[PDB]
Structure 1
Amino acid sequence: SAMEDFVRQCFNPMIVELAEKAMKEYGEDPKIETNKFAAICTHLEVCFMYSDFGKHRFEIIEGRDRIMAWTVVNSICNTTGVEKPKFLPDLYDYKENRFIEIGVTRREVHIYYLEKANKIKSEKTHIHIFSFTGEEMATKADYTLDEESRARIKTRLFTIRQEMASRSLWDSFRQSERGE
């Protein structure tokens, strides 16, 4: 498939390694579930771009094995007092002192927003949704990052989108709702 080839073409090795690991945690083959392969990679990259942009302001919980992810969640909760999320989130924002759930969607942002929000049902985890179209939605329209940092995520997402479309892989990808 050209999709696996493109995943290994545009995503640096670190992310692809982690993506295959998270794909085995579902008995899943990235050579078959390749749209999930790419979505997992893209999301991972968004989380990593977000953390680095914010003296470290964000703690990455995404990309950890579940033992260490929940260990970091628990350490944060016990030293700040934030409420234990029911589900593992993506970042902790030490500045606003909240958990952030990063959403990357091929659908409208408002829709995947309502989806994550209705799933988490704890208005104490901040949601920030990014599309491949330079659109973003976010709890209380608080976007956390400076405008520039968000420019950078949106440019990267739109670049994956155009690079998939130059390979004739974007119609398949947007017409899939896995990785979401």
Structure 2
Amino acid sequence: GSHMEDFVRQCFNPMIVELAEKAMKEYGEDPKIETNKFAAICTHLEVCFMYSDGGSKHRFEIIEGRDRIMAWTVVNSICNTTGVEKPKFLPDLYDYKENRFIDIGVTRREVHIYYLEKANKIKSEKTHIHIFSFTGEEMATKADYTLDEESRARIKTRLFTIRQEMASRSLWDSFRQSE
């Protein structure tokens, strides 16, 4: 019973805690032991949700959060109706306005290093990449940040609040080094 686990459950809403637990069990991980990974997946899920709430009413199709079979099912329907290339790895959203997939990243390091790592792993030249850091930095493909400044600023504010809450509980140092 770690202090980080009880922080995660009181920091994020139950629906995000619920979806993070299922995703962790789907890949053979337990939130009780790998607690830094538990906090990271919750954080990434909330950012994806806030991101999709950034645009118009039905601009974004949410891929993250679904189980693997249904996520690929929605990816196939999106590809087989818009003509966009089928990515090698599952993205997080699909932008119906810009007609592209998005993989959102949240990192505790330099946005530069995580982008180059995500681009190499995703191996999908068409998938748009948007990186957020816990320090307020962001990096996106072709400098195209999709949403307006205020929607992104709310995400950055929430990320820094998560950092402060962890630091006030002496959980940030273990969280920052765990990446």
Shift of the alpha carbon at 1:58? Answer: 0.6
Number of corresponding residues: 177
- Sequence identity percentage: 98
1:104: which partner in 2? 106
Tell me the secondary structure at the aligned position of residue 17 of structure 2: helix
Deviations 1:130-172 (A, max 9, x none): 0000000011111001000000100011110110001000000
Give per-residue Cα distances to partners, 1:46-103, cap 9 Å, x unaligned.
Answer: 1000011114111100000111101110111111110100110000000110000000
Task: Please tell me whether the aligned partners of residues 88 and 123 of structure 2 are also in contact (alpha carbons under 8 angstroms).
Answer: no
Which stretches of structure 1, 4 residues or longer, exceed 6 Å deviation after superposition?
Answer: none
SS in 1 for 2:53: helix
Alpha-carbon separation, structure 2, partners of 1:121 and 1:88: 11
Q: Matched residue of 2:128: which SS?
A: strand
For 2:94, the equivalent position in structure 1 comes to 92
Q: CA deviation at 1:27?
A: 2.1
Instruction: Normalising by structure 2, report the TM-score.
Output: 0.96
Out of 61, 64, 69, which is 1:59 matched to? 61
The Cα shift of 1:9 comes to 1.0
> How many Å separate the matches in 1 of 2:118 and 2:49?
20
d(CA) in 2 for partners of 1:71 and 1:53? 24
Q: Residues of 1 paired with 2:168 and 2:147: CA distance?
A: 30
Distance in structure 2 (CA, Å) of the matches to 1:119 and 1:30: 24
Say which structure, 1 or 2, has more relative contact order (CA 8 Å, 6+ apart): 1
User: Which secondary structure does the structure 1 equivalent of 2:75 belong to?
Assistant: helix
CA distance in 2, matches of 1:11, 1:157: 12
Q: CA deviation at 1:121?
A: 2.6
Superposed CA RMSD in Å reads: 0.9
Counterpart CA distance in 1 for 2:124 and 2:39 is 28
SS of the residue corresponding to residue 95 of structure 1 reads coil
- The equivalent of 1:126 in structure 2 is 128
**Structure 1 unaligned blocks of 5 or more:** none
Counterpart CA distance in 2 for 1:23 and 1:68 is 16
Distance, in Å, in 1 between the alignment partners of 2:27 and 2:10 is 24
For residue 15 of structure 2, give the secondary structure of its aligned residue in structure 1. Answer: helix
Contact 2:134–2:156 at 8 Å: present in 1 too?
A: yes
The aligned residue for residue 21 of structure 1 is 22
Contact kept in structure 1, 2:111 and 2:132, CA below 8 Å? yes
Normalised by the size of structure 1, how large is the TM-score?
0.96
The unaligned stretches of length 5 or more in structure 2 are: none
Q: Does the C-alpha gap of structure 1 residues 142 and 163 become closer, same or farther in structure 2, counting only changes over 3 Å?
A: same
